[PDB]
Amino acid sequence: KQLFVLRLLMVALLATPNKIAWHPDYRTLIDTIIELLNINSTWLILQKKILQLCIKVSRKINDFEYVAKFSSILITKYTHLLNQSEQDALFKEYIQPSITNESITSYWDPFILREVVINRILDSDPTSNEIPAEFTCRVQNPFKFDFTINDIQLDEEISEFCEIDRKAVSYSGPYNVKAESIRSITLPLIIKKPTYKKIYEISCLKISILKLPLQKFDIINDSRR
Amino acid sequence: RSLKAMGEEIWKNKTEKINTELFTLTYGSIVAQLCQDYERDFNKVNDHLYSMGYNIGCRLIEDFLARTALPRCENLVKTSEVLSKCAFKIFLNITPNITNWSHNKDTFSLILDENPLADFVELPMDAMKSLWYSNILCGVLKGSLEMVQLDCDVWFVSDILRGDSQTEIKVKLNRILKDEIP
Amino acid sequence: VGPKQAITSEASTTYYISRIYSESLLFKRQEASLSAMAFLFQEMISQLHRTCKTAGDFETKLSDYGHNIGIRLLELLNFRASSSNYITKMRRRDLKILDILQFIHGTLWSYLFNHVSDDLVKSSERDNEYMIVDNFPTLTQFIPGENVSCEYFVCGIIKGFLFNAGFPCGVTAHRMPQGGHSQRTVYLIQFDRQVLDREGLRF
Amino acid sequence: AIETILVINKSGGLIYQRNFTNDEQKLNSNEYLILASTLHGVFAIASQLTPKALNTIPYIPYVGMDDFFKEPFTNWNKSGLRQLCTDQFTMFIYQTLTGLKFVAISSSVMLAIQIADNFLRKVYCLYSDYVMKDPSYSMEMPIRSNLFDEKVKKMVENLQ
Amino acid sequence: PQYFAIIGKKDNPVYEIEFTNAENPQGFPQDLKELNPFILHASLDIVEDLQWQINPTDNCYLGKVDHFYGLAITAYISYSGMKFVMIHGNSANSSVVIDDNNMRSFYQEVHELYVKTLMNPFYKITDPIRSPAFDSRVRTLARKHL
Numbered sequence: 001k002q003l004f005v006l007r008l009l010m011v012a013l014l015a016t017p018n019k020i021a022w023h024p025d026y027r028t029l030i031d032t033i034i035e036l037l038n039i040n041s042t043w044l045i046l047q048k049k050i051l052q053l054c055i056k057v058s059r060k061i062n063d064f065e066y067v068a069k070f071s072s073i074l075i076t077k078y079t080h081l082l083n084q085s086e087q088d089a090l091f092k093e094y095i096q097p098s099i100t101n102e103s104i105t106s107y108w109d110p111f112i113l114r115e116v117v118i119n120r121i122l123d124s125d126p127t128s129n130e131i132p133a134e135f136t137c138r139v140q141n142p143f144k145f146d147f148t149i150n151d152i153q154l155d156e157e158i159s160e161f162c163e164i165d166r167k168a169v170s171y172s173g174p175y176n177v178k179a180e181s182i183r184s185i186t187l188p189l190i191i192k193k194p195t196y197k198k199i200y201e202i203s204c205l206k207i208s209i210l211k212l213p214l215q216k217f218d219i220i221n222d223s224r225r
Numbered sequence: 226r227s228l229k230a231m232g233e234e235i236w237k238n239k240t241e242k243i244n245t246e247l248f249t250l251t252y253g254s255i256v257a258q259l260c261q262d263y264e265r266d267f268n269k270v271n272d273h274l275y276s277m278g279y280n281i282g283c284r285l286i287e288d289f290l291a292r293t294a295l296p297r298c299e300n301l302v303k304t305s306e307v308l309s310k311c312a313f314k315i316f317l318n319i320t321p322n323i324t325n326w327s328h329n330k331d332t333f334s335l336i337l338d339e340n341p342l343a344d345f346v347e348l349p350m351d352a353m354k355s356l357w358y359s360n361i362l363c364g365v366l367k368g369s370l371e372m373v374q375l376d377c378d379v380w381f382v383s384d385i386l387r388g389d390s391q392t393e394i395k396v397k398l399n400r401i402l403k404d405e406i407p
Numbered sequence: 408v409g410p411k412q413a414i415t416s417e418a419s420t421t422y423y424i425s426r427i428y429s430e431s432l433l434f435k436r437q438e439a440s441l442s443a444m445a446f447l448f449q450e451m452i453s454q455l456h457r458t459c460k461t462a463g464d465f466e467t468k469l470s471d472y473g474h475n476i477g478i479r480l481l482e483l484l485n486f487r488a489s490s491s492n493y494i495t496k497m498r499r500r501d502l503k504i505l506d507i508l509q510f511i512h513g514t515l516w517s518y519l520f521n522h523v524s525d526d527l528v529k530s531s532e533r534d535n536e537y538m539i540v541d542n543f544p545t546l547t548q549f550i551p552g553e554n555v556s557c558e559y560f561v562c563g564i565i566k567g568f569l570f571n572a573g574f575p576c577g578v579t580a581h582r583m584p585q586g587g588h589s590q591r592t593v594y595l596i597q598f599d600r601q602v603l604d605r606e607g608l609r610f
Numbered sequence: 611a612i613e614t615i616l617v618i619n620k621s622g623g624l625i626y627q628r629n630f631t632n633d634e635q636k637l638n639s640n641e642y643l644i645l646a647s648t649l650h651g652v653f654a655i656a657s658q659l660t661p662k663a664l665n666t667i668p669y670i671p672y673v674g675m676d677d678f679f680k681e682p683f684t685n686w687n688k689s690g691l692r693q694l695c696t697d698q699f700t701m702f703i704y705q706t707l708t709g710l711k712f713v714a715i716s717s718s719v720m721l722a723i724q725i726a727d728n729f730l731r732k733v734y735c736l737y738s739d740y741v742m743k744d745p746s747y748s749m750e751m752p753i754r755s756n757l758f759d760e761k762v763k764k765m766v767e768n769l770q
Numbered sequence: 771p772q773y774f775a776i777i778g779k780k781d782n783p784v785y786e787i788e789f790t791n792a793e794n795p796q797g798f799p800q801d802l803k804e805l806n807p808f809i810l811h812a813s814l815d816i817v818e819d820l821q822w823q824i825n826p827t828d829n830c831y832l833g834k835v836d837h838f839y840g841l842a843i844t845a846y847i848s849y850s851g852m853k854f855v856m857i858h859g860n861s862a863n864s865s866v867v868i869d870d871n872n873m874r875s876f877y878q879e880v881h882e883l884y885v886k887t888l889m890n891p892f893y894k895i896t897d898p899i900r901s902p903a904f905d906s907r908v909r910t911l912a913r914k915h916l
Contacts (some may be wrong), residue, residue, distance in 0.1 A: 001815055003812075004808045008807055038486060041781045042896065043782060043783060043807055044784040046807045046808075050802070079411075081411045231473075233677070240442065241441055241545075242441060242521075243441055243444060244437070244438055244439075245438065247519055248443065249449055249892075250479065251451075251472070253476070254472045254476050254891060255472070256474065256891070257892055258471070258472065260892065266757065277450055279757050280450050281446040282454065283749070284446065284449075284742055285446060287710075287737075287742055287879060288442050288742060290707055290734040291731075291738040292678070292679075294731065296684040296686070297707060309526065315440065317437075317441060318439060325576065335713075341437055345432070346890060346892070347887075347888075352892070365446075369665075372708055398558040398614065404651060404707075405620070405705065406657050406689075406705075407657070407686065407688070407690065408787050408902070409898065414775075414788050414906075416785040416787050416788055416789055417790075418790045418795065419790065419916070420791075420792035420914065421790050423909070423910055424910055424915060425906065426903055426907055429886060432882065432885065446743065449743050452745040453745050462879070475891075478888075479888060479891075480850075481850075484889065485849055486885065492878070492879070494878050497829075497831075497878065500821075500849045501832070502824070517806045520804060522827075543661060549740055549743040549744060549757070550744060550745065550746075551754075553756075557780065571851055572849075586853045
C-alpha cells in the first residue's frame, strides 16, 4: 500500500503544471520506489509501468544520469513485451537526449554480430596459392553481417574496424542498420599486409554506434572463430 | 480358464499392494526431471527412459516366475497374449487387449484400454512430436522377454496423449537359441 | 494470459463450450504390486548412483523428486480430507506446526502406505527440532539400510509438504534400532527460526 | 538337516556360500568356486546320456512355518542332475527357466527330493525379492545383503 | 467489467484476465491501469497479514476485504500457496453487491481447474498458464455466476 500511495505521489508530480528544479530528496524517493521492489518479484508488467513513471519523473525534474540509468535498465532487462506499440516507437527519442549528453556509454546489447566470413573474390587466373579451416588471405574483400533485436531504427554503425592484430583492418562503414531484421553489411574492406606468417586469431572487433569505441563483441552461442 | 482364473487368485498373496497414485506420481516426476534436464530433447528422453525400462526388464522376470510358478511358454503367440493379459494384472492391475496380427500373427499388437502411467497428464505443445510418455513399458517388456530368450522388437505407434484414440505396441519377434540345459 | 502479453480479453456475450480434456479427480483404487513400484524405485536409485558424485549431492538429487510432487499431493490430499465436487466446505488450514505434523501422521501415511507412523514426538531439549519415526519403512524395506541415503525419498516428500505450508525446514533422516522393531528410521526434522518466531510471537 | 546352501548364476560361477550349521571349516572361497565350475561342467553333460534311447509335477507340504503358493507346481528341470547321495552327506539342485542353479547340501538324509524341492522354490522366491530389488546388487555378483542372509538363516531353523 | 487474477507466492501472476459485460461493452476506460497490480499488490499485503491469523470456520474463503476510493475488492486464499482475486464492478455505480455464497461457488469451483493443471507434471510452479482451454472454460464458468 505504501508503493500504491507513492505511485500516486509520483503521478501527482507528473500532472502538476508548476515547475521544479531538482531537490535532493527525489534521489531517495525514486530509490525507495525501486527498492520496494527487489529489482537491481516476477510481476514484469508492473516493472514496465513503474519504470515508465520513474523515467517520466526524471524527465520532468531533469536528473540526467537517472534517466540514463533507469532507461538503460529498462531497455536491458525488458522489451520482449515491447513491440513497436506500447510507446517503443515513441520511445528512443527519449534517449537520444541521453546519447547527445555524455550520459550513457558502451551500447548495452552484448549480442550484435551474428557471424564472420572473409569470403573472397577471384580476379586472375593462376595468381593463387598453388601449393599452400584457416584462410591464408588472398587480396580481396570481406563481409561480416549482424543482427539487431531492439526494433528501433537508426542504429548507425560507424567505424567498424578490427582489433589489435596487423594491418588487416577494416576501412569504413558510413551507413546504418535496420529496425528489426538481421541486416547484411556493406563493405568492411580490409587493407591487409604481408607480415610474418604465424597464426593470429580474431574473435571479434570494435564497433561504435554513434558512440564510444567498444571492445570485441563476442559472437553468439559459439566462438564462431 | 486355468491361467485366467489363477491370475485373480494369485493377486492375493504375501507381499502387500499399494495405490497406483504414488507409482504414477513417481513416474511423472522422473519423466518431468528428465525432460527438463535434457533441454527438451524429446528424442533423448525416449531412449533414456527406454534403457531405464530395459534395466528392470532384465530383473522383472525372476520375480514373475518365482511368485507365479509357471511353465515354459511353448506357443509363441497365443500363450504370449494370454500371459501378458494376466501378467500386467499381477503387477499393475490392468487388462490390455490383443488384436492386429500379421498373417502368421507375428507382428501382433497389444491395445491397452486404460493407462495408469498417465491417468492425468496433458503433455505440452512442443512435446507433441518426438516423445511417447510411457516407453518404459517398451523397455521392460523387451527385457522381460529377452530373458526368456525371445528377441522381441517393441515400439509404440499410437497412444492417447499424443492425440490418437488407441494405445498399442507393435512387436517383431526375431529368434534366438541356447536357452539352458533343461 | 501470457507473461509477455497483457491481461486483455473479450466480452462475456457468447458461450464457448469448446472444451477438450477435463474429468473426475476422485480417489480411485487400482493398487499395483509392491514389486512393480519397488522396481521403479530400484532403477531410479540406480540412475542416481550412476550420475551423481558423492553423498550429499545425491541426497539432494533424491529429495528434489519429493519436492516436485509434495506440493501436488498436499493440495488434493487436503482437498479430499478436509473437504464434479459438490462441495460442502473446505476446512481449516495449518494453524501451527502441531496440526500439520499431525496431518502427516493422520492421513499422509494412510494415503500412501495404508497405516500410520507410530509416533510424532516433540523433542526434549529444543523446539525447532521435531521427529517422526516410521517403524518399518515400506518402499525401502529391501535395501540393506546401513547407508541411510536411500530413504531420502520420504524426507524430500515431507519437505514439500511443509515448504508450501510456510515452514522452511531442514529435514533429515537417521535410523536407530530402539525396539524389537528393527530398522526403524527416524525423520528428525528441523525448522528455521523465523516461522518458529512467528510461532514464537504468541504460541 | 541342511547345513550349507549355495546359489549359482547362469554363466557358471558361484554367487553365494554359507556354511550354516557345521561350524568347523577347512574350505575357503575359491575351492567352493572349483565346486561351482565343476557342477556346471557336470550339468552340461548330464542330460545327453539319453539312456532311454528314445506330466511330472512337484507337490505341496507347506515347508517353512504362511507359505507363498499352496499348489502342486511345475518344474523346468526335465533332464539333468537333481540330487546326489554319498555316505557323509547328500546334495540337491534346482534350476530356473532363466538359468540360476540352486544348490542345497545336507549332511544327514532328508518324497525326499520333493521336500528339498519345496524348500528351494521358497529361497528362489526369497532371492528374487531381497537381493533382486537391491541397487548395490550389480548383476551376477556376490550377495552382500545381510538382510538376505539372516532371512535364509531363519529358514534353516524353519526346516529342522 | 470483471477482472480475475491468480497471484502466486513470489508476487507473480500465474493467471490474470479481464472481461466485460456487453451492457458496458468496454471496461474501466482510463481506470483499467490503476485498478491493476498496485491495488492487487496491496491486496496481497492485506491477505498476507490476514491469512496467518485465526481472527480478523471457513479459513479459505474470506469475502469482501477492502475498498479503494472507486470500488471494493474480494479475495480467497488456498493452501496451495495461491491467492485468488476477482475484481468486479460497473464503473459508474459504487458496486456493493457481494453475493458471498454463489461466488463462493466460483472459488472452490475454479480451484479444480487449477488443480488439474497443477497435476500436469510438465507444468512447474512459478510459471503462467497458456492453456487455450482452461481460460476459455472460466469465462463460461463465469457464465454460471456473473
